[PDB]
Design a protein around this ligand. Structure first.
Ligand code: ZN
Lengths: 259, 96, 910
């Protein structure tokens, strides 16, 4: 009658991504664990761009767009920062934001590549992922014109905009051999063996399971460079716990009002 | 500015002797002479000291403890004669 | 989990049945001592107060118990008025038991509400009613406040005086009422009023019950209010003399004992005189025992000097007569407590006429010994222990009578029936620890006692066996004869536990008779199961054998000295290998290993020095003369190649001396014996250094006279005495030989060699802390900076600051303060630049005092360099007297340093 004992284990880890397996857990909880990675993993990304003077061939709004999508290293300072719309202060304060500056004046004959390395930050903890490999391109500049802007970056999360989404790609699956027979193959010969399959060469089709439920879910989360994958997963779980706690508190108050 | 309020009992020449000492966390001790006007005299040999002590320092990551104590000088050297108290201080760095 | 655990009990408190409600209520002290957080404590007590206010009159009893159990946690309540209102709201309930419970609870809350006038009033009201079960609780609460408040006690004392002197209230309650008058110590006027009340109360109720209660209560009062003790003592003495009630006399004794134990000096002369007269008059043995116990307690303290203070012969003094008569009185207990006073007076006060009393005492001692020899009763052994303690005190205080007492004790060794023998042997060993002639000549008789052990007892052969081993080793100064093999066989044929043989081996090694140690440990080696003990035993065997080999030294023969030293070092090295192997994460033998390793270092220094001085004749003069003209030698005054080696070895010896300093200031745990031993070794090292420096190097520069008190017989062990003798010999030689010859070291080599031989002559003594460790203390010191899971360095913007929050807790395994009690912790923090004054700009210290067991300290570190940094924190505990006592884990943390690119560009442009 109680939630089963979830059991997990990692296959291998790397800066690029993390691959792991979950055992003794339900499909719905696994799916929610996935969804939280895509949606509810807050990070720091540029969100307020003020342009003193723009003269390149990319119109200003395009530059604001591109600066929006650059990734920033937010290993732990994300916890310290507190949402902008929620922080009570004058406009932006060092607690609820971070400041970036970008001034470039191409004066040489050759075209200059205005690139992310030129974005001067205020706090060393956060910088474009490329800094700390080729640079992320912003806009090319001909001799003569200039680009001067000041940006403020804040803490958001997936729902608000996809520039806050750090999970480059999540591969979620289970029953690599359709044992549960959720899916049906009219010609199971044609389909390719899943890399996680354990079937023989001839069979290539697990037997039907009269009694069973999805188990041993497989996860492969690839970071976009904003956060280490392990930190991503931990933050996902912690934020989901926070949400559940909020729901419990509100509904307890509702029950007390009811009675 | 930290308001400092104290009661001094049975002291001769309080105004020329008593001095407020502030020990910062980092091991530096600053001596502060209160003004001759800071010493009220409600009753016989029982003075009150009211003053401001000015604290300052660069930015700290977290709150710290600044110790405030009352010293007695002589004519050369000093004697603590009071219980040190702790005050929480937090200098944040400049804003925009 | 701290918040969750509370609501889990909350729902229980909300359960319907008093079963679950009681289970919840009595479950809190667990949660408190699990989570001492003040927020949780306050939240808990609010619900406890509410369930007390609305309860089933048994939940109230449970809550009363909870309050009486978790009293230390009460002070840390932020919200007091609400809680006290809840508790006090059930004092108006008409139920005479619900009033009694609440009065008890208030009494249990004097600590946090000691000035509440409404509580004071309610208690003073309930104190005069008709319901026994509430009056007997109001009495308790009144006694509780009368200690933590004054303006309540002033009113109470008057109330109680009236309410005693009114014929109301039964005698049973009048008994409970009087003790409140203990806590009238707040003011002198309170004490005077209470005493005036007593003088009438005792005469107005001359019962036995009331007298027994009142006299004790007000002797406690006199102890507390230290202004009328002279008055209290004379009243007690009058009641001792006059009242015939045996019980009242016995209370008088058991009360005068407390007063003589707390404040002995105030006792005047006539007080002691009258007490002695009363002790003489009584015909009753038990009362005489009581008075003599009181007198024995007084004698040890300063009171005796005042009593024998002049401005009547001491023989005219009655105290002497009582002492003498009781020294021979029939009863064993009376005789023991008599000899006590005699010994104390003889040791402390030294008058011309008292010398005959020395003979009187010493002769009474053997009478006591023979009387207690064979009784074999618990009281008999108690008296015997007291007698032997008196013997030890007499001997050590006065060396004159040591020879007298020792021979007697030896003669009783024959007649002791194997029960008192252990005690007597302990006494003898303690005595012999001072003077050697007390052990040197009595070799055979002790072994005659030893040989008959196997047959004269079977129940506790082991303890007397080990004791006899200790005494025989102490007596044997140089080595062991056939007596040795006789001991070996005695053990073999007689029942001999492995543990026992180990203890005899330990004592042998401790007293220096290393010859027996190697033999015994060899027998041990083929024993034990775990490898750790085998390695430890083997290491100890090798050490003992090396010491034995060293002992075979010949006076003034440099040839054999080098070979013997080399051989003994060839063995210590195996020993160190084995010992280092014996270590484990548990009990890593730090002191044992380090002390012995530095011992090998010492002996190597000695070998190098002896080789150098011998090489003095190794064509040394040839070098200096050939290099430069001998006259006005540039290399040195009569320069020689050996000058460089003499500088080298002098430096090495000083360094070794300081390494003993490191060991000593690192132990902090051993008793006062091992510390003196280590200091002694450091003294030897520094002695050789001073000798070589003041005799070979510039002697005129030193030109220091050994003008200090020397040779005072204050040493605590024969080993120390012998070392002090050797030091004095070396100094008296070197002072004479300072200027006689030129630095060319004609005979100076002879003096150095003789000093080395002397220093090696006294074999060694592995001290207690080496074997068996007591008073285990440690500092956990888990600093809590920005935590760093791996060794990955931590970041700081470089422009602002860093704060550490070094947290430390001190943990005691054994008796917390057996010898030294921690008084302060001198945390010293330093930083260094990892990649490279090496950047010690941030090097500071704070002396935090641990208030209960826990001390936190905020440390601020400033630094503005790119590279990583190492942060070192050193504990340096400090004890009562004030000493460095360097200890502490000495943990390190790595910290990274980075700068904002904003400032980076600013600096670049500038
Ligand atoms: Zn803000």
């Amino acid at each position: 009658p109680y939630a089963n004992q979830p059991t997990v284990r990692i296959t291998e880890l790397t800066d690029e991504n993390v691959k792991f397996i979950i055992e003794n857990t339900d499909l719905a909880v696994a799916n929610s664990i996935r969804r939280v990675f895509i949606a509810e993993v807050p990070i720091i990304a540029i969100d307020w761009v003020q342009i003193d003077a723009n003269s390149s061939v990319l119109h200003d709004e395009f530059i604001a767009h591109r600066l929006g999508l650059i990734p920033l290293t937010s290993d732990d300072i994300v916890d310290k920062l507190q949402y902008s719309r929620d922080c009570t202060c004058e406009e932006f304060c060092p607690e609820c934001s971070v400041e970036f500056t970008l001034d470039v004046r191409c004066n040489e004959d050759q075209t200059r590549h205005v690139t992310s390395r030129d974005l001067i930050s205020n706090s060393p903890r956060v910088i474009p992922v490329t800094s700390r490999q080729d640079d992320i391109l912003i806009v090319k500049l001909r001799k003569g014109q200039e680009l001067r802007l000041r940006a403020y970056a804040k803490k958001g999360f997936g729902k608000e905009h996809a520039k806050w989404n750090p999970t480059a790609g999540v591969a979620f699956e289970y029953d690599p051999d359709n044992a549960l027979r959720h899916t049906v193959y009219p010609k199971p010969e044609e389909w390719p063996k899943s890399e996680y399959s354990e079937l023989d060469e001839d069979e290539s089709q697990a037997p039907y399971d009269p009694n069973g439920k999805p188990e041993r879910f497989y996860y492969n989360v690839e970071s976009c460079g904003s956060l280490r994958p392990e930190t991503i997963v931990l933050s996902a779980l912690s934020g989901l716990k926070k949400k559940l706690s909020d729901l419990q508190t509100q509904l307890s108050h509702e029950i007390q009002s009811d009675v | 500015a930290l308001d400092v309020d104290a009661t001094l009992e049975h002291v001769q020449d309080p105004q020329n002797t008593v001095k407020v000492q502030v020990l910062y966390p980092d091991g530096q001790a600053q001596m502060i002479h209160p003004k001759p006007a800071d010493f009220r005299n409600p009753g016989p040999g029982r003075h009150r000291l009211i003053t401001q002590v000015y604290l300052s320092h660069t930015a700290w990551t977290e709150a710290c403890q600044v110790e405030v104590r009352l010293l007695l000088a002589y004519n050369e050297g000093t004697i603590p004669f009071s219980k040190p108290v702790k005050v929480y201080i937090m200098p944040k760095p400049a804003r925009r | 989990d701290a918040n969750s655990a509370l609501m889990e009990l909350d729902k229980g408190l909300r359960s319907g049945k008093l079963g679950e409600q009681c289970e919840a209520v009595v479950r809190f002290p667990r949660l408190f001592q699990k989570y001492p957080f003040p927020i949780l404590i306050n939240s808990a007590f609010l619900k406890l107060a509410d369930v007390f206010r609305v309860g089933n009159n048994f939940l109230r009893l449970c809550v009363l118990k909870v309050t009486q159990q978790s009293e230390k946690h009460l002070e840390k309540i932020l919200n007091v008025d609400e809680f006290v209102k809840r508790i006090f709201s059930v004092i108006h309930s008409n139920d005479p038991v619900a009033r009694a419970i609440t009065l008890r609870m208030l009494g249990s809350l004097a600590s946090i509400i000691p000035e509440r006038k409404n509580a004071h009033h309610s208690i003073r009201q309930s104190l005069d009613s008709h319901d026994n079960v509430e009056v007997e609780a109001a009495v308790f609460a009144a006694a509780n406040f009368s200690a933590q408040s004054k303006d309540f006690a002033v009113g109470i004392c008057n109330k109680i005086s009236e309410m005693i002197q009114g014929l109301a209230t039964p005698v049973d309650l009048k008994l409970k009422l009087i003790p409140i008058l203990q806590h009238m110590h707040h003011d002198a006027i309170l004490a005077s009023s209470a005493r005036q009340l007593l003088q009438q109360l005792v005469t107005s109720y001359p019962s036995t019950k009331m007298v027994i209660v009142s006299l004790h209560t007000f002797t406690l009062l006199a102890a507390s209010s230290l202004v009328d003790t002279p008055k209290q003592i004379q009243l007690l003495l009058q009641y001792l003399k006059n009242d015939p009630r045996k019980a009242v006399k016995r209370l008088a004794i058991q009360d005068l004992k407390l007063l003589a134990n707390k404040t002995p000096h105030t006792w005047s002369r006539e007080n002691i005189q009258a007490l002695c007269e009363c002790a003489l008059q009584t015909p009753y043995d038990s009362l005489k025992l009581g008075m003599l116990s009181v007198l024995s307690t007084l004698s040890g303290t300063i009171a005796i000097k005042h009593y024998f203070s002049i401005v009547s012969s001491p023989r005219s003094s009655d105290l002497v007569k009582l002492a003498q008569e009781c020294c021979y009185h029939n009863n064993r207990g009376i005789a023991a407590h008599g000899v006590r006073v005699l010994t104390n007076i003889t040791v402390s006060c030294q008058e011309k006429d008292l010398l005959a009393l020395e003979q009187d005492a010493v002769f009474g001692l053997e009478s006591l010994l023979v009387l207690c020899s064979q009784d074999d009763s618990p009281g008999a052994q108690a008296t015997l222990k007291i007698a032997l303690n008196c013997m030890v005190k007499l001997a050590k205080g006065r060396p004159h009578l040591s020879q007298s007492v020792v021979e007697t004790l030896l003669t009783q060794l024959h007649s002791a029936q194997d029960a008192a023998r252990i005690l007597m042997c302990h006494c003898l060993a303690a005595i012999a620890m001072q003077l050697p002639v007390l052990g040197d000549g009595m070799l055979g008789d002790l072994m005659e006692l030893y040989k008959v052990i196997g047959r004269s007892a079977t129940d506790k052969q082991q303890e007397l066996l080990v004791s006899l081993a200790t005494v025989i080793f102490v007596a044997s100064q140089k080595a062991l004869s056939v007596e040795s093999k006789a001991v070996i066989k005695q053990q073999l044929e007689s029942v001999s536990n492995g543990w026992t043989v180990y203890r005899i081996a330990r004592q042998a090694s401790r007293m220096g008779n290393h010859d027996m140690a190697k033999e015994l440990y060899q027998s041990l080696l083929t024993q034990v199961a775990s490898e750790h003990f085998y390695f430890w035993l083997n290491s100890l065997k090798e050490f003992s054998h090396a010491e034995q080999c060293l002992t075979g030294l010949q006076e003034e023969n440099y040839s054999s000295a080098l070979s013997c030293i080399a051989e003994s070092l060839k063995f210590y090295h195996k020993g160190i290998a084995s010992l280092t192997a014996a270590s484990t994460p548990l009990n890593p033998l730090s002191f044992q290993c380090e002390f012995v390793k530095l011992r090998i270092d010492l002996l190597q220094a000695f070998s190098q020095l002896i080789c150098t001085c011998n090489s003095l004749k190794t064509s040394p003069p040839p070098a200096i003369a050939t290099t430069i003209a001998m006259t006005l030698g540039n290399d040195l005054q009569r320069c020689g190649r050996i000058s460089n080696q003499m500088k080298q070895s002098m430096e090495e010896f000083r360094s070794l001396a300081s390494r003993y300093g490191d060991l000593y200031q690192a132990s902090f745990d051993a008793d006062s014996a091992t510390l003196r031993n280590v200091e002694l070794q450091q003294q030897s090292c520094l002695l050789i250094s001073h000798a070589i420096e003041a005799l070979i190097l510039d002697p005129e520069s030193a030109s220091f006279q050994e003008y200090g008190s020397t040779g005072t017989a204050h040493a605590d062990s024969e080993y120390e005495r012998r070392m002090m003798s050797v030091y004095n010999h070396v100094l008296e030689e070197v002072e004479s030989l300072n200027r006689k010859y030129t630095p060319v070291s004609y005979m100076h080599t002879a003096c150095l060699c003789n000093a080395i031989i002397a220093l090696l002559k006294v074999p060694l003594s592995f001290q207690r802390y080496f074997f068996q460790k007591l008073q285990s203390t440690s500092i956990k010191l888990a600093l809590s900076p920005s935590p760093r899971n791996p060794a990955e360095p931590i970041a700081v913007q470089n422009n602002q600051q860093l704060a550490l929050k070094v947290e430390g807790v001190v943990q005691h395994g054994s008796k917390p303060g057996l010898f030294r009690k921690i008084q302060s912790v001198c945390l010293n923090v330093s930083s260094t630049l990892q990649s490279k004054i090496d950047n010690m700009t941030n090097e500071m210290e704070q002396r935090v005092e641990p208030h209960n067991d826990y001390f936190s300290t905020q440390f601020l570190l400033n630094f503005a360099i790119l590279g990583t940094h190492n942060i070192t924190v050193e504990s340096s505990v400090k004890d009562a007297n004030g000493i460095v006592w360097k200890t502490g884990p000495r943990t390190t943390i790595f910290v990274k340093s980075l700068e904002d690119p904003y400032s980076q560009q600013i600096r670049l442009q500038q």
